[PDB]
């Protein structure tokens, strides 16, 4: 019925930075003053920092600033903290005749800089207790590290995969500020046994780890 | 303390209709407009509709179909109701007088809403640790094939917290959730050390334990 479209999706900057998030109506309500700013930590309620464009909650520290401008609202934190890395959405309140309608934004997930990190990384085979079920999961951990964004390939005999595999990443890590990823490789258990060599390689700019193991020797 | 309370959470099954209910201790119910929002697993949040401190309720596009907000000021309740529930309904439901425009803005806890069309314990099978690690070594458990969500998996009976990685489920083709849980601890603890992840299953009330030995 209508969009607060946020932006950026995500974004990341070090503490004391100045952080700006916008948030658009898509049509145009000319002037819309029960818009607010909302704040979502990791497993917890939204909590409320921004009413009314502006007004700033009593307990919510100042360095959060809401501004105005008719359809696009603006929250702003001066100086940022350490408890300020959270999802932030924005919502409004339209209403014409036969309809009422609250809007939340997409969200912006405020992540925190820091020094680039090279995952542990490490190979799992299958155990034995799953093969007699059929299946075969080869899973592959990469270990605290920054930034997020890493190729994870699976190689079977020296053969690129694809299509069997899902990845799964966590939060960044609330003390040294890195993720952890895990890829897991499904095979039957029929072609985890004609094959020898599995391999995991992890492409992070210019370096590459491949971490294998040969099906039955340690 | 905690002034507004959702409940009535719990399982439905596909078609069935969940019926939330908030409740308000420590004043009324009457005097202000209360809205309901849900958030799916790693979604946004999402409006369904509120009620008015007067008595008309206004809904979304999809909720409209779906969706009725009623009160109660006798039990200081209003109840959301929906109905032909689906996989995209499972969420986190919330009431809240959202404040948008207002001082006044209070929210709930929230309440799971699970839509399932099976119940299936999960398997779990070791992460055996490394035997190529006086270093730092990788062992874990893998916890597929079980429906619905959540799994809660913790190490040793909480005992071992630090360096724990429980990741996020992901779906399977198979329509089945896998998730895994790792933990890095000390090479020269392998033969010393127990280690046992304890997966549950509330759903299926299964608690699965699983050693993760060397080799």
């Known amino acids: 019925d209508i969009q607060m479209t946020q932006s950026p999706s995500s974004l990341s900057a070090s503490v004391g930075d100045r952080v700006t998030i916008t948030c658009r109506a898509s049509?145009?309500?000319?002037?819309?003053?029960?818009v607010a700013w909302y704040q979502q930590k990791p497993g917890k309620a939204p909590k409320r920092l921004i009413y009314?464009?502006?007004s700033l909650y009593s307990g919510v520290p100042s360095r959060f600033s809401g501004s105005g401008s008719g359809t696009d609202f603006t929250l702003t934190i001066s100086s940022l903290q350490p408890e300020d890395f959270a999802t932030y959405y924005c919502?409004?309140?339209?209403?014409?005749?036969?309809?009422?309608?609250?809007?939340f934004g997409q969200g912006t997930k405020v992540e925190i800089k820091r020094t680039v990190a090279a995952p542990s990384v490490f190979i799992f085979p299958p155990s034995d207790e799953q093969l007699k079920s059929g299946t075969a999961s080869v899973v592959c951990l990469l270990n605290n590290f920054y930034p997020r964004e890493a190729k994870v390939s699976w190689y079977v005999d020296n053969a690129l995969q694809s299509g069997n595999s899902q990845e799964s990443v966590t939060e960044q890590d609330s003390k040294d500020s890195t993720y952890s990823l895990s890829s897991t490789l499904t095979l039957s258990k029929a072609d985890y046994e004609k094959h020898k060599v599995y391999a995991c390689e992890v492409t992070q700019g210019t370096t590459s780890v491949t971490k294998s193991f040969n099906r039955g020797e340690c | 303390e905690v002034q507004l309370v959702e409940s009535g959470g719990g399982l439905v099954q596909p078609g069935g209709s969940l019926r939330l209910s908030c409740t308000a201790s420590?004043?009324?119910?009457?005097?202000?407009?209360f809205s309901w929002v849900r958030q799916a697993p790693g979604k946004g949040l999402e409006h369904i509709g509120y009620?008015?401190?007067?008595?008309?309720?206004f809904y979304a596009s999809w909720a409209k179909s779906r969706s009725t907000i009623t009160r109660n000021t006798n039990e200081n309740t209003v109840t959301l109701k929906m109905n032909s529930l689906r996989a995209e309904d499972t969420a986190v439901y919330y009431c809240?007088?959202?404040?948008?425009?207002?001082?006044?803005?209070?929210w709930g806890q929230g309440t799971l809403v699970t839509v399932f069309n099976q119940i299936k314990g999960p398997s779990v099978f070791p992460l055996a640790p490394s035997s190529k690690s006086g270093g730092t070594a990788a062992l874990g458990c893998l916890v597929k094939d079980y429906f619905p969500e959540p799994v809660t998996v913790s190490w040793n009976s909480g005992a071992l917290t630090s360096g724990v990685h429980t990741f996020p489920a992901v779906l399977q083709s198979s329509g089945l959730y896998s998730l895994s849980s790792v933990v890095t601890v000390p090479s020269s603890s392998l033969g010393t050390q127990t280690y046992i992840c304890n997966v549950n299953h509330k759903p299926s009330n299964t608690k699965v334990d699983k050693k993760v030995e060397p080799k």
């Open positions: 809240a007088k959202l404040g948008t425009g207002s001082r006044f803005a209070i």
């Open positions: 420590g004043f009324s119910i009457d005097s202000y407009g």
């Open positions: 009620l008015t401190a007067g008595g008309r309720a």
């Open positions: 049509q145009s309500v000319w002037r819309n003053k029960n």
């Open positions: 009314a464009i502006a």
């Open positions: 919502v409004g309140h339209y209403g014409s005749e036969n309809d009422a309608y609250y809007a």
